[PDB]
């Protein structure tokens, strides 16, 4: 509490629209979460709300465990995690309704 950790999900291919990012993603995606943290379902006005919070908290928690371990997430990383963690939070909000 107040957060909960969801079960792990299979990684989607995600196409980012440019040759450089697709390659970048494929090479760095192992560094990103494959499961999400969230607050209970009865604490949000909607999906959009849940998802916003699930994405921020998760990247923050994920960013903290990686830094202790050294290394950093860059802006592309941060950009790509949001997209993919967003996808994941959405599947999770669905598993609840």
């Amino acid at each position: 509490g107040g957060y909960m950790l969801g079960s792990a999900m299979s990684r989607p291919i995600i196409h980012f629209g440019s040759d450089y990012e697709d390659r970048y993603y494929r090479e760095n995606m192992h560094r990103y979460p494959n499961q999400v943290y969230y607050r209970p379902m009865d604490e949000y006005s909607n999906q959009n709300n849940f998802v916003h919070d699930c994405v921020n908290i998760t990247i923050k928690q994920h960013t903290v465990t990686t830094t202790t371990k050294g290394e950093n997430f860059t802006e592309t990383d941060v950009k790509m995690m949001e997209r993919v963690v967003e996808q994941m939070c959405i599947t999770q909000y669905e598993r609840e309704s």
Partner: antibody
Amino acid sequence: QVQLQQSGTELVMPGASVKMSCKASGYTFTDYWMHWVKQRPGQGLEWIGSIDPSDSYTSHNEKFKGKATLTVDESSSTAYMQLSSLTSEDSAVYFCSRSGYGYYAMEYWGQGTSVTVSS
Amino acid sequence: DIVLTQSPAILSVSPGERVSFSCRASQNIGTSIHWYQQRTNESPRLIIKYASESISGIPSRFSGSGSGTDFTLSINSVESEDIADYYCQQSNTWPYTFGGGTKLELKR
């Protein structure tokens, strides 16, 4: 056979918005990025923005960011681009196009919606 | 932004002749350049992808070569239906950019 269907023409008042449609068929809609390209009369191509129908993630030409809103309707295999606050600068043909799978040459092109801005 | 420069802006050619035009990028893009043909009052059409890969249903007389910053499209035997504008475009990084086009014309 892949098709991308665009309305031929739109007459829109200066200051008004227009929402142009691009309806895809003959393939799996969510598997390919769709792109929108502007061409002013007698001039070259200009990229506006692109969208991944799978999650509606978008990329824009910086100068269209705030001007062109890209969406899809997954239920109807349709991509839409809305232009708001039209001026004579917006009179042009707008093509939609579809790239390959994880590759970004524009493989299929719509016939273009010719937009005329006039009072 | 990667700026793509095409030259010449207009080229006059005689039928059956072999012709070429070039697309040069301000930064290295590997092979991430594509070529389109646009005849008067038509949509553009993909002619070569990724510098050199041929496209289904496009005549084998079209070819492209190059890698890095300097790219060339060549047409082995120009036919009247090839008279059109040709644009290059990159997809290596955002924003996508297009060359300004090379217009093909018939010598008379």
